[PDB]
Amino acid sequence: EGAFAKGTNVLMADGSIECIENIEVGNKVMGKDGRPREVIKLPRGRETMYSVVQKSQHRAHKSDSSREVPELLKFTCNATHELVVRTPRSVRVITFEMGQKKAPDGRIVELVKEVSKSYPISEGPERANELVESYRKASNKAYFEWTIEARDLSLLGSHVRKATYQTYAPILYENDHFFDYMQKSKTIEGPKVLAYLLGLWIGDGLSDRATFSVDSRDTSLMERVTEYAEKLNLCAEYKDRKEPQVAKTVNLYSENPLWDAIVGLGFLKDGVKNIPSFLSTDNIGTRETFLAGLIDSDGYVTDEHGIKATIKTIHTSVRDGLVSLARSLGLVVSVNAEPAKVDGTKHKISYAIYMSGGDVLLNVLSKCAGSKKFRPAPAAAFARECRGFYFELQELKEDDYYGITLSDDSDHQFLLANQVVVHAC
Amino acid sequence: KLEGAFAKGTNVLMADGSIECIENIEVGNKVMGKDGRPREVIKLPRGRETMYSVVQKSLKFTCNATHELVVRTPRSVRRLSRVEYFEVITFEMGQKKAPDGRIVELVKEVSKSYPISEGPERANELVESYRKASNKAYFEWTIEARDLSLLGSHVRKATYQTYAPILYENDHFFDYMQKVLAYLLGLWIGDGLSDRATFSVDSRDTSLMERVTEYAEKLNLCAEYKDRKEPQVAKTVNLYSGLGFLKDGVKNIPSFLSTDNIGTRETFLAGLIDSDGYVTDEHGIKATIKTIHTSVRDGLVSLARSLGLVVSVNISYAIYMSGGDVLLNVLSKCAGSKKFRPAPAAAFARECRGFYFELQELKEDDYYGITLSDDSDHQFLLANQVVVHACGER
Ligand SMILES: [Zn+2]
Ligand SMILES: [Zn+2]
Structure with a gap:
């Protein structure tokens, strides 16, 4: 029932990339697992399509030159495709809780909602302050992890919508x-x-x-x-x-x-x-060492508001490849075009790639030899967490859609070529 | 000897929120403890000694050679292969003999390696032993200013001081x-x-x-x-x-805000951010305020750090603020469409913030020090919120 637009690149189980229309039954797409996930069925049809794109200052490079920083976190899906989302838990008495909302079409859809319980003053102690402590202890996970069909996103209230995000997994x-x-x-x-x-x-x-x-x-x-x-x-x-x-x-x-x-x-x-693109699915230690080399060469590390590394490059090919590689490790990546320096020849535009991610980054920097680049390796073992991105959904016209169906209770998730975590029934 | 020694004019935060230069502090006086509670001054140690300046590597103060700096260094462990062995590098508390023969305790980068032809047995046990030998991700300790130069390059750079929220x-x-x-x-x-x-x-x-x-x-x-x-x-x-x-x-x-009601500080700050603040999510929540009025820049940095926020500055002054749940606790009181952000998911602690610094040996000078009740944690806050150590005494 859920599907994508023709051309949607999917990350296959072996790390190769394939257009959604070209995947066949029996093929194996990549699970956030890093493990395979067999495609058992390929749903087809026509339906209103919705476009998903990470909310950024980019969004352009699609049929032009490469100077313009493209926004890679995106994809087009059909109206019923379920978006894999996260919304933080929150309590201020206002709270974010899993609820229900009468969908126009009469469907009853589960969604995160902002609620508030106001009780009589003069008794505050056991009053509201009783819930806050219970809510704060309600869940160990500081966020809700659920799904929502693209058509239903517009049902979310202002606050929940703005706070809800999608994720991409490291490779x-x-x-x-x-x-x-x-x-x-x-x-x-x-x-x-x-x-x-x-x-x-x-x-x-x-x-x-x-x-x-x-x-x-x-x-x-x-x-x-x-x-x-x-x-x-x-x-x-x-x-x-x-x-x-x-x-x-x-x-x-x-x-x-x-x-x-x-x-x-x-x-x-x-x-x-x-x-080279292969680097994104190759040995993780190798990806990190390459990066550390890049950082030692033409980059810098800051730590004021969190450990952060920046790489500078005038090559558009290096820029996009870096972004892909950095994210393949589970790093949070940002790109900004700024004025370029001179060497003898004057370049107009230079690209600054900013990377953050706590231990993930620390695991890269601990391989640098640069005086101000190196940072001690993590204090302990760490997980390469999924990273979130705020997005914008835009309703589009009706069109052909292509989807895949994953095995019975597998987690029903796989990764698109851009590492975004998507759902498949 | 035995004390917390600072250069004349050093401003310390008293226990009532007021500020006083170090030289004007008297016995019986109470300075601010990092827990927001008092620390009674018992003696007023003074004398002459080589001085050292501490200044955040772009928060600053001047102390004497034997003054103990309250520092933290992260714990760190990593495997590596390299005539060919498995090597495990760690940051651990150790000993180092100083030029004057003194044996100084401090964090050191230690390497342990053995033949690959001997199995990963110990290599993995070492990391295992390391990754559970402590309940925390960092070393909390102290070191005399004069001994800081003893740290190896790596440990030195990863070692920082801290400031506590008020x-x-x-x-x-x-x-x-x-x-x-x-x-x-x-x-x-x-x-x-x-x-x-x-x-x-x-x-x-x-x-x-x-x-x-x-x-x-x-x-x-x-x-x-x-x-x-x-x-x-x-x-x-x-x-x-x-x-x-x-x-x-x-x-x-205003100054009093920094030591006033925390909810009031946040609210004023939410009102300020709604006024002309720019919040971004890029690599962690951050709020940016711009001003021309230095009195404001200075007043804001203080108020922000008072809450336990991490602050940076950048005529136009750009004040950057971050800190996770602490900042969220501020933005959730905002009404601005792009300013508001949901309040924290659970209870959060206003943790001490770290700051990297440069230490510079100065010249001999008079110093003014204090000592605290031997019954305390032997630490207090300077007006700039930096956590400093002062020996406890009877
Ligand atoms: Zn499902
Ligand atoms: Zn002492």
Whole structure:
């Protein structure tokens, strides 16, 4: 009964991507689980379609150039498709509670609602303050986790609607293409140092050779480079001058292993740098190390209002790939176009990717060697939680829809290519 | 010896919410405890010693060499592979001999590694032992200013000091009443005039309009909305029918607020945010206030930190505020359409906030110190809310 528009990209169980119309019975799409979920039926038909998009200042790049930051968190579904949502629990006596509302069509739909119980003054203690404590203890989870057909979203009150959000899950699944490439290309620290160096190169490397820049003042980062380049058989050479007494050029010599990877893995294609898509479903440690390399190269870390890392890039291909990779780890990601710097040539626009996520981020930064980049690894084990995004629903015209049906009691959830968690009956 | 030693002029928060320089504190006096309760001063230790300045790495104070800094460092553990072994790196309390032979206790980054050809046995047991050897995610401890340089680079950078919210509450505002007033004052001192009880309100926001009216009525005041204050936007609001908000011709957020009733602080702050605040959800809830009046910037940073909020600043002054449930407890009192945000889901504690800092060895100078009742936690708050240590004494 629930379905998506033609072209909706779905993340398959093996990490590959597939358009919704092309998935067949027997195929396996990705569960938030990182585990597979067999498609048993493919519902078709026509129905009013609704568009879902994360509420952002973006939304444009769809058939134009890539300069415009696109909004990847989106998808179109039919009127009856159930949106996987979350609304925080709240108590101020006003509260958010699971309730019911008479739908126009006469359907009785369960939804979160704002309610209030006003009782006579002079007795406040056992009065209302009795509930607050009970509500605050009602649930360990600080949020409601339920679903709601797109057509029914408009039934929610102002406060609940504005506070309700959808989620995207990290990509827990892991292919091993990075390691596979190295092995078939003929040490245990191998993948790590390679991914890191690929990070440094993507951040500020020459598009034609295995060379990039490093902070000339950051002695520990240079040690790291020398060290890592060493583990791969690279007599890494440094050269003074790069930025009016700030950066330093690094030439990694040995065919060149680092350069062969750049090309072979697709970090360079048609002279344009980028973050190959496979990275999003590859070894998690590898994704983190690559990122740390990127952060050590052209990024910064702030912690005032929560640990946060920013990566700067003039390459649109790196921008979108980074966003995808960062979210594949379960990081919260934001993008902003700002004025660009000069080097000799003047670039108009630069992209700043902001990443946050507590321990998830800490697990990336603890691999950096950058003086101000590194942060100690998490204090304990941690879960890569689902991340929420506020969205806007827009009713559209009637159109063909394609949906999938998951196995009997499986959790009825799977991920779209953009990691958004969706429902399937 | 034995004491909490600060440079002359250091402002400490007293137990009644008032402020006093360190040199003016006398025995028997009571300074503010981080729990909002008093800490009696027993002795007034003084002398000469090398001084060190503490200043938030962009909150500041100057103490002497032996003064103990109240610090926290996160716990941390990680596996890694590397002539080839499994390595586990941890942050744990340890010992380090100082140049003067002194054995100083402090957090150290420790590495334990053994042959991969020996099984993951211990490697996983180590992390296991570490990830349960404590009931908390951080180390709470102290270290003399002069010993801070002993910390290894990694531990040093991850080590921070803290400031506590001001839990103590004065009924100065309530008493004067002869809440609703705090909110309006927030609007009043957020987009209002100066010479009259008139302020600006977004004409386009029934929610807010409803609020101003409803609240004015509860304070016996007609509505009054003479339109045209801003090019088809702000609709002037007059309220027909002291505390210090009106100061020196420019708007100013009173001092007493910081130590007044917490609900009153929040309400005034909600009124201020509804007035001209910008709340964002991006990477955690945050509220941004912009001002030209320094008296306001300073008054707001104080009031915000008093609640346990994390604050940043950025002529135009941009004051950024964050803090999860603490901030939510403020935004839920707002009426603004884009300002309001649901109140916390459960009970929340106004936790101490951390701040990274730079320490700089200065020159020998006089110092003024105090000691607290040996029966206390040996800690108190400076006027800037920083939690400092003072030795306990009989
Ligand atoms: Zn279902
Ligand atoms: Zn002591």
